[PDB]
Design an enzyme around this catalytic site. Sequence first.
Site, short mmCIF file in Angstrom:
data_model
loop_
_atom_site.label_atom_id
_atom_site.label_comp_id
_atom_site.label_asym_id
_atom_site.label_seq_id
_atom_site.Cartn_x
_atom_site.Cartn_y
_atom_site.Cartn_z
N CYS A 69 -1.65 1.28 0.00
CA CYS A 69 -2.50 2.45 -0.13
C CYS A 69 -2.85 2.74 -1.60
O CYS A 69 -2.16 2.30 -2.51
CB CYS A 69 -1.80 3.64 0.48
SG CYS A 69 -1.63 3.59 2.27
N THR A 124 16.73 1.81 -2.56
CA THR A 124 15.53 1.05 -2.22
C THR A 124 14.56 0.94 -3.41
O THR A 124 14.46 1.84 -4.26
CB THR A 124 14.74 1.65 -1.03
OG1 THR A 124 14.04 2.82 -1.44
CG2 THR A 124 15.66 1.97 0.15
N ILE A 125 13.82 -0.17 -3.45
CA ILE A 125 12.73 -0.32 -4.40
C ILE A 125 11.49 -0.85 -3.66
O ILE A 125 11.59 -1.65 -2.73
CB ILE A 125 13.16 -1.19 -5.62
CG1 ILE A 125 12.03 -1.32 -6.63
CG2 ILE A 125 13.71 -2.54 -5.18
CD1 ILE A 125 12.48 -1.91 -7.94
N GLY A 153 7.39 2.10 -7.09
CA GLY A 153 8.27 3.25 -7.02
C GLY A 153 9.53 3.00 -6.21
O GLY A 153 9.92 1.86 -5.98
N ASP A 209 9.72 15.39 7.88
CA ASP A 209 9.63 15.30 6.42
C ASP A 209 8.22 15.31 5.87
O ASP A 209 7.94 14.64 4.89
CB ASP A 209 10.43 14.12 5.88
CG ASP A 209 10.88 14.32 4.46
OD1 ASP A 209 10.87 15.47 3.99
OD2 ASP A 209 11.23 13.33 3.80
N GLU A 269 1.02 -1.48 4.92
CA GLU A 269 -0.31 -1.45 4.34
C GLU A 269 -0.28 -0.84 2.93
O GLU A 269 0.32 0.22 2.73
CB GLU A 269 -1.19 -0.62 5.27
CG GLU A 269 -2.65 -0.58 4.92
CD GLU A 269 -3.39 0.38 5.80
OE1 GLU A 269 -2.84 0.74 6.87
OE2 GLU A 269 -4.51 0.78 5.41
N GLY A 299 11.98 4.55 -2.73
CA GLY A 299 12.21 5.44 -1.59
C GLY A 299 13.57 6.11 -1.72
O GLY A 299 13.89 6.66 -2.76
N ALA A 300 14.38 6.04 -0.67
CA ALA A 300 15.74 6.54 -0.73
C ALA A 300 16.52 5.77 -1.79
O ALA A 300 16.23 4.61 -2.08
CB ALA A 300 16.42 6.41 0.62
N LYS A 313 9.06 -2.75 0.61
CA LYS A 313 10.30 -2.06 0.32
C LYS A 313 11.48 -3.01 0.47
O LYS A 313 11.67 -3.58 1.52
CB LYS A 313 10.45 -0.86 1.25
CG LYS A 313 11.73 -0.07 1.09
CD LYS A 313 11.50 1.44 1.18
CE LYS A 313 12.14 2.08 2.40
NZ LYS A 313 11.74 3.51 2.49
C1 3E4 Z 1 6.75 6.24 1.82
C2 3E4 Z 1 7.17 4.88 2.28
C3 3E4 Z 1 8.11 4.82 3.26
C4 3E4 Z 1 8.54 3.63 3.73
N1 3E4 Z 1 9.40 3.61 4.70
S1 3E4 Z 1 8.98 4.06 6.18
O1 3E4 Z 1 10.10 4.72 6.74
O2 3E4 Z 1 7.76 4.85 6.24
C5 3E4 Z 1 8.54 2.83 7.19
C6 3E4 Z 1 7.21 2.84 7.51
C7 3E4 Z 1 6.73 1.85 8.35
C8 3E4 Z 1 7.56 0.88 8.83
C9 3E4 Z 1 8.88 0.87 8.51
C10 3E4 Z 1 9.36 1.84 7.69
CL1 3E4 Z 1 10.99 1.75 7.35
C11 3E4 Z 1 8.03 2.48 3.19
C12 3E4 Z 1 8.44 1.26 3.65
C13 3E4 Z 1 7.94 0.11 3.10
C14 3E4 Z 1 7.03 0.18 2.08
C15 3E4 Z 1 6.62 1.41 1.65
C16 3E4 Z 1 7.11 2.55 2.19
C17 3E4 Z 1 6.70 3.74 1.71
O3 3E4 Z 1 5.78 3.77 0.76
C18 3E4 Z 1 6.05 3.76 -0.55
N2 3E4 Z 1 7.23 4.07 -1.00
C19 3E4 Z 1 7.52 4.08 -2.27
C20 3E4 Z 1 6.60 3.76 -3.21
C21 3E4 Z 1 5.36 3.42 -2.78
C22 3E4 Z 1 5.08 3.44 -1.45
C23 3E4 Z 1 3.80 3.06 -1.11
C24 3E4 Z 1 3.42 2.66 0.14
C25 3E4 Z 1 2.13 2.27 0.34
N3 3E4 Z 1 1.32 2.27 -0.67
C26 3E4 Z 1 1.71 2.65 -1.85
N4 3E4 Z 1 0.87 2.64 -2.83
C27 3E4 Z 1 1.03 3.46 -4.00
C28 3E4 Z 1 0.15 2.93 -5.08
C29 3E4 Z 1 0.35 3.68 -6.37
C30 3E4 Z 1 0.02 5.11 -6.19
N5 3E4 Z 1 0.41 5.83 -7.36
C31 3E4 Z 1 0.74 5.71 -5.01
C32 3E4 Z 1 0.64 4.89 -3.76
N6 3E4 Z 1 2.92 3.02 -2.06
#
Ligand code: 3E4
Length: 403
Positions: free
Chosen positions: A85, A24-25, A18, A128, A83, A20-21, A39
Amino acid sequence: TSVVIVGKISFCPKDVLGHGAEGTIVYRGMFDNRDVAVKRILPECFSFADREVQLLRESDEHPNVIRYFCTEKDRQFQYIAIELCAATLQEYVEQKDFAHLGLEPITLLQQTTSGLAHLHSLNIVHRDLKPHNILISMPNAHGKIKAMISDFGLCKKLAVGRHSFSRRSGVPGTEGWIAPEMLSEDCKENPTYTVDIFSAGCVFYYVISEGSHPFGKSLQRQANILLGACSLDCLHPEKHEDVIARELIEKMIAMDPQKRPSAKHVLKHPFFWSLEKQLQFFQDVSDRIEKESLDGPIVKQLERGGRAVVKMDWRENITVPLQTDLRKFRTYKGGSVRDLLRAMRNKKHHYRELPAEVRETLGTLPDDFVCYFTSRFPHLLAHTYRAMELCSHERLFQPYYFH
Ligand SMILES: Cc1cc(NS(=O)(=O)c2ccccc2Cl)c2ccccc2c1Oc1ncccc1-c1ccnc(N[C@H]2CC[C@H](N)CC2)n1
């Protein structure tokens, strides 16, 4: 390019999880033989994410905050690995059949709140909270799961000796989950930790309603938040578990921020108590008022509004074998909350010694016994919990209240 390797991190670009902002990918990948979410971010975000990583060598040492693992740098990109999830809480709520889940959804709520309490204890307001970023872990070998808070892009660490933070331009959260004090007109106090409590309150109802929201369908729920127009339809006014749920949730989503409980207060609410702990509460309360005056403040609070709770006479709203056993003693007042609690305490204490048919009407200890009373008097607990807040600082009552 089939597998990208940037330092300790690796992934196939095809394994997109997926985004994020904007800009990002997120990919699925590997770090030190662990599954991670990776990310990828652009240069404009490089110290915006270093700010959030500094917070996360300090916050993610909690089981219900997402674990940070690694950061790696390309010629053009940064890579953040956390991690992996299994799901989001939205996915859990909207797709799973709740018939087969028992107490799990409520445990995920506990874990989330607990993660939130951790953050708040480090001076961090998340800002958030929503089902979309409350992540559900991969199950362990026994199928056990847990919730973890993620998505720290809007987090704010309050400086030492500050207890609030002020508004800025831009969307402070996600539409439909934003506490009213972040948007409302002529607001004269600054926002604080309680904005997360409002969001959580909404999340709580969302989990237990199986997908509804206190403020309506997605189209006009933010507008309804500013108007204070909520509804908790799915909670019956005369079902013990719904009444306990309601009592908590309506406070968590209070329009006045100061009426909302802190995360630690929420963790102590009966919403989270097992049946045996509820029964133990009733007993600890009865031992506590065992030698109190009818006119003292404690017993006064407990009786205020008591008759409606007790159904005017509680002797008339119990089964015939029990009603007979209690009438004989000639001591219980049927218009009193104290005496119903005392009748419960006594029947628990003397349970083995009670006549067979009294034992059978009550059912077994602890689970059926407590339900005998809570199913017949669905406001007993909620009401007893409010009144006994007078004793919330006492050591006897710290399993039940916080502070
Ligand atoms: C919500 C979030 C926020 C992020 N940024 S953050 O601000 O929380 C952050 C957290 C911890 C340390 C640094 C930062 Cl910048 C993420 C950063 C790196 C990787 C994932 C991040 C993140 O998670 C995801 N973002 C977009 C898509 C997927 C995820 C994600 C993260 C963990 N596991 C999964 N697994 C998916 C598997 C498929 C399922 N349908 C949903 C869950 N997805």
